[PDB]
Design a protein around this nucleic acid. Structure first.
Lengths: 257, 185, 171
RNA sequence: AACCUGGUUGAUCUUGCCAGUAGUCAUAUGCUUGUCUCAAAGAUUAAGCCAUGCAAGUGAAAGUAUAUAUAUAUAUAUGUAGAAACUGCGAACGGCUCAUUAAAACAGUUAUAGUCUACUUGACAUUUAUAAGGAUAACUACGGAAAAGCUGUAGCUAAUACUUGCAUUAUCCUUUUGGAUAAGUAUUUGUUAGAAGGAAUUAUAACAAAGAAGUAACACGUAAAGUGUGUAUCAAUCGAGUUUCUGACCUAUCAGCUUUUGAUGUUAGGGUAUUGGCCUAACAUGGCUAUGACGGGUAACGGGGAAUUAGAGUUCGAUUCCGGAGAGGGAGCCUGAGAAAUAGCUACCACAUCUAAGGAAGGCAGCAGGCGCGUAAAUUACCCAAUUCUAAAGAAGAGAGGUAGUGACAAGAAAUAACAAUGCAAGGUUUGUAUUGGAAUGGUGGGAAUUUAAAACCUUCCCAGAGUAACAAUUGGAGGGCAAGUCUGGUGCCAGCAGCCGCGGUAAUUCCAGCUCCAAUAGCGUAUAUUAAAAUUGUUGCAGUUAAAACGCUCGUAGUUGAAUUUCAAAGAAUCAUUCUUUUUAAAAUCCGAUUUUGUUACUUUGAGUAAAUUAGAGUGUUCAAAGCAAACAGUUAAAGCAUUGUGUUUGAAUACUAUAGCAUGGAAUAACAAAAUUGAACAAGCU
RNA sequence: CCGCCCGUCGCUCCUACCGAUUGAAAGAUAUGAUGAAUUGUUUGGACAAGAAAAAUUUUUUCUGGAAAAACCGUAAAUCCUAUCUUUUAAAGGAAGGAGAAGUCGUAACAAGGUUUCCGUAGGUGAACCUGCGGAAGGAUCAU
RNA sequence: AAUAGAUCCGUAACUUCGGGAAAAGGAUUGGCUCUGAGGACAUUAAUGUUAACUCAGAACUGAAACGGACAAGGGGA
């Protein structure tokens, strides 16, 4: 037959998964869920190859059996569960909270997060639908459906979704001064203020983003994520703060120690 | 199926197999560096051609080209770390002038012979094979070991070697001597 | 059953590999006669059920000028734009012309307006005699081989005039 | 490393090829082979045939248990398990192979506003009830058949198997509150209104008809109310089917193809999940083609890639990954979300098994293995420990996969000594060199630590354990090309050698041998193919008077190529003498003297998307290297950092390339096309 | 130049060609004929369940329904015919190449003893000869 | 003796290019019920009256038969 493929070859795995060639012939195919396979990482990899808590898949299963790891404050027990771009995974045993982010290089890194920030996740809206009764519902990057959004929320906006109540608290627009983070581009993981946008009739829309050091980089509209206004980010960025350094000064300031 | 373990050649055959002058200079080099076979200097030329091609390509680029100020500095620092370049070097042109003896100077047997230890280059080779020498905290028995500028300071006899403070001498001769002494006494 | 085994744009024939897949499919047609209502069920792709009607006698028919739909019984299929063996063998297809019992529509008109929303429209004269005979002309609008029922709408105006000329400087 | 050399002649200079030369992740084969690491392996021919064994199953809270066993206070209420069986999910993934396939598949680039989509995730629902019905497996007993995943009759019983079936919400008025009004999820038809997209016959809403399927008659228990299973719709996700543009080898001794029999299009319908000549009916005569249609060939699966490369190029790509296809050859079909499935079924053809002769049963291009074919390719081994998949999802399986065996396919490191004294030679008491004679050390044998699923291997430690270190290195040559003998015997145009030129008839530098020497070296030859050499395929970059080669001549279409000309210029800051940066200078619309756009394309510049493996390349002492993607740092056991007492810390897994086509983008040059007169405008005023 | 050298005819071997034989074989297409299996529809119609009465039995009806059959459709397979592709037999015929001191002549290279050569045509044992028109690659760069 | 009419399809070697050729070799044909196409004539772009048998297609039907008798080539090397 020709049904859905259910295996993932090790070399065919996404690059940011960052697995070794000789470490077996297969990679864990993420179960279908809230995030795309390419745009996410299974929690098996998250806490075997990143947190190093478990050194085999079986120990990953042993961890997951105890309802101790919660993705967005709800217990998850699927080994190949897609965690996705930004969300709060809380481990109760060590009482630690990680918000998943990108880095300037473009891999998925857990970021240590305090309790007050761990109940406060960001969701980039992707679609605005209206169902029966003229009730509007937002489809977010998280694969989440939020009914009864404010009318002022637009298609590309980003809402602060509270983890417990699942309700939006406030939304951020996509003006030319809005802080943004690139999610899949050549400049994945970069953070900037959106210098400008341009609308292409019937084709991809490009936006040019200004860095902290006045560095302009362009990207497609489909893979940007508003993370705040001009004032400041609404989350805590990793140690590079989303500032991608050039290949020269990166070596230069790595050398000095 | 097929393993994903990469592997590659290290030497290129010379072509024109019976060039008199090339054969004579190869014999000069292998005899005076005490190496074992014509494959070794061919690996050395293969390596040297690699750095030479890198340097030529870099020098084709214009100055202030980020490719240049990255690859050229990486190559320069690598060369000065392996010891093929002195502090008086600053440019890639000086890299281009690297020669076969300047690359053969960094072999482990060459270095131990220069530092002493062995009074012959072949003696150095055989000692390295008999694992009597250490590059500091680690013992290597590969004569083609290339030392860096931070290693020659701590090349010395291996601690487990008889010349490094281990078991003194021929246990057979010592046992025979002690047995004869005990029988006579 | 679809998409291959035929000449290219240029007229050359294509050597065939990739024998028939299930998703090409192509089930046999449903020559829907008119008679006692009977419908079979066909399990299409993805377990979506389709209703293959074999015989129908009634259906929902609409008064489009008034925009009101009433269920009624069809009498006889008298024209179809496609091959005209379908009318002779009395099959129901998407847009064939049929005859409809007009009594439900006349009764509805009486009970709503009286006299033998968007009210007081003055109708048209040419449909009056067709009503008075008792049987009216309608065009099917559903796909009986797909939805399992034969719905339609009364044809009037120049469309009715066109079909009237096409059916009966005439034979 | 952007390379040449022998051979036509008496001798010369050419053209020109033959031969030599080197590489091949390129096969075979010959000789030889002491270590370790790494690891290709029945593709080539026979997608030929297969004995045997295995390769997909699944129950740890959670469908169904009087098969049965057990344990708690006393025949009671709880449990613990549980063969079989029904039910559920999976078996459509994986693995193998490359026969078919030449605008097909594939690749980049789109569309799906033309669709389907199980698991999983988020939202969320409409026209007897202190809980409804029969009917069946397992099992019981009677049986049949030589045989099989064969099953007959009678009797019960369950289920999350199969099937029926039980409040409420919203809206309008006086105006917290009282009255009044209305009630189908998808889907289909008809009539209308109409947050987003680029564009809607979109979302959605109103009216008139139909209308599925559902909304729990189900099982376990979490805060010092949860979960599981199941369910309508929408959305996400894992995917899929179609789809746009562009891109392929040889052949014209294939020039016209297609069109009754769908060829090209229109209309209507049928069919499909959806669009579509996909099919039907009517109609029209179209559609492709020297820019190579239609055919033929391919010892053709495509690509990522490989060899060779100075730059171009040439050749290869069955084979780690992706896509496609197939399961002896065809066709057909059931279940299912998903199959035209093949360790699923049905039939035919070719094979072929058992048979009591009545009848049954089959598909190794899965893993081993066998026959055959051949120049050409391994064990009927071990294990689920790692990677990962399936399940009722710790706990079971998995010839997937991993481990070992065979393995000179390739690739990397690297033994076969080293040292001191005399004697000898060379030199002004320095090197080389047959004697002695003590050190060093592996190979090897044994034990162990360790490793490992177990074992083996590596590493490490301890015993033994080298002088002809018998613990002995070979392969091919010694006329030239081409490094190395006119040394010695045999043969004597014979035998033979010789890639080519040539040698061999008594001095054979070439045969057969010995010695010596040369080259490479645990490797070295041979055959075939391929690349460079080959500027002997020539775009870069050949040649055509006489070496091969200007059509007999002219016209001529396609093709290729095409004179000049339209905005020139001027002025200012910064290194060294110069170089480099900035401003305005016609006209028309925008801003109350100032605010600002001024063909198309090629081409070129920048970006976005750029799967990995491979490649280039940054970092990193795997003892080096091939590698790999890791790792590094203080610490005879504690300072320091931070936390208001404990918690290791610092990291890296970069970057580039990813067509020529497609998207966006700055553009002055060079190229085209557009507009431009037997005319074509613009403005102002009046008129409609 | 006692140089070189050409062709026929003899002999041997190898390669390839033509070839009667309505030659042969193996495939591949196309048409036609027959046509298994089967989707769908229809016809059935073993029965299995319901509804009425008499106080074990009967009629009728309602669905659900197995064999079997027919018809469109999908269509394996076999056969006939035709064409094409590849391989291959063959009396005889006619080439080419190689071998050896074979036979016959002297064609070319010297003005090669008739200058050589081209195109065409005829003839002859062979090289070759001759006619017509050309060329110098001539034996003439020239009253 | 074998078909032999007509319609549709297909047709080789050879050739004086005209033929060969009805080459060879296939399929169909009845009856019935229908459907489509092919003309002429007058009035104020549209409505009526009327004729010929000739082709094409579809259902149904029968002991698969239909140029039903009559009539009427055997081909090929």
């Amino acid at each position: 037959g020709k049904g859905i493929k259910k295996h993932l070859k090790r070399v065919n795995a996404p690059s940011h998964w960052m697995l070794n060639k000789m470490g077996g012939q297969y990679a864990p195919k993420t179960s279908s869920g809230p995030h795309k396979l390419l745009e996410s990482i299974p929690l098996v990899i998250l806490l075997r190859n990143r947190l190093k808590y478990a050194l085999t898949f079986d120990e990953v299963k042993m961890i997951l059996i105890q309802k101790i790891v919660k993705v967005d404050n709800k217990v998850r027990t699927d080994c190949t569960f897609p965690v996705g771009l930004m969300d709060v995974i809380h481990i109760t045993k060590s009482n630690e909270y990680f918000r998943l982010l990108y880095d300037i290089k473009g891999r998925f890194v857990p970021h240590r997060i305090t309790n007050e920030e761990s109940k406060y996740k960001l969701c980039k809206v992707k679609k605005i639908l209206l169902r029966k009764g003229r009730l509007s519902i937002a489809v977010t990057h998280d694969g989440r459906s939020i009914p009864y959004i404010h009318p002022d929320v637009k298609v590309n906006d980003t809402v602060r979704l509270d983890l417990e109540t699942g309700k939006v608290l406030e939304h951020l627009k996509f003006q030319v001064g809005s802080l943004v983070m690139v999610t899949a581009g050549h400049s994945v993981g970069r953070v900037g203020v959106i210098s400008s946008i341009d609308k292409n009739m019937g084709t991809y829309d490009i936006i040019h983003v200004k860095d902290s050091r006045n560095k302009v980089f362009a990207t497609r509209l489909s893979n940007v994520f508003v993370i705040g206004d001009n004032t400041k980010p609404y989350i805590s960025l990793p140690r590079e703060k989303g500032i991608k350094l050039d290949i020269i000064e990166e070596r230069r300031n790595r050398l000095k120690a | 199926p097929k393993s994903y373990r990469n592997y590659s050649k290290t030497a290129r055959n010379p072509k024109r197999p019976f060039e008199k002058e090339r054969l004579d200079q190869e014999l000069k080099l292998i005899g005076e560096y005490g190496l074992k076979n014509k494959r070794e200097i061919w690996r050395v030329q293969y390596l040297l051609a690699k750095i030479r091609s890198a340097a030529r390509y870099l020098l084709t680029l214009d100055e202030k080209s980020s490719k240049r100020i990255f690859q050229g500095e990486a190559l320069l620092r690598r060369m000065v770390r392996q010891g093929l370049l002195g502090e008086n070097e600053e440019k890639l042109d000086y890299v281009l002038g690297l020669t076969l003896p300047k690359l053969l100077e960094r072999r482990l047997q060459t270095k131990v012979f220069k530092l002493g230890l062995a009074k012959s280059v072949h003696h150095a080779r055989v000692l390295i094979r008999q694992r009597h020498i250490r590059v500091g905290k680690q013992m290597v028995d590969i004569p083609s070991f290339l030392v860096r500028v931070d290693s020659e300071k701590h090349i010395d006899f291996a601690t487990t070697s008889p010349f490094g403070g281990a078991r003194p001498g021929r246990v057979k001769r010592k046992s025979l001597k002690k047995q004869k002494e005990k029988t006579e006494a | 059953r679809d998409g291959r085994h035929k000449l290219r744009l240029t007229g050359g024939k294509k050597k065939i590999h990739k024998k028939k897949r299930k998703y090409e499919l192509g089930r046999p047609p449903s020559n829907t006669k008119l008679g006692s209502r009977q419908v079979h069920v066909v399990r299409g792709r993805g377990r979506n059920y389709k209703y293959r009607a074999i015989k129908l006698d009634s259906g929902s028919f609409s008064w489009p000028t008034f925009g009101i739909s009433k269920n009624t019984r069809i009498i006889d299929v008298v024209y179809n734009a496609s091959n005209n063996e379908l009318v002779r063998t009395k099959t129901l297809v998407k847009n064939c012309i049929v005859v409809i019992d007009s009594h439900p529509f006349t009764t509805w008109y009486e009970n709503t307006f009286g006299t033998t929303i968007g009210k007081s429209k003055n109708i048209d004269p040419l449909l009056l005699e067709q009503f008075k005979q008792g049987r009216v002309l309608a065009c099917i609008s559903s796909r009986p081989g797909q939805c399992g029922k034969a719905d339609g709408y009364i044809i009037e105006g120049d469309e009715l005039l066109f079909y009237k000329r096409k059916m009966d400087k005439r034979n």
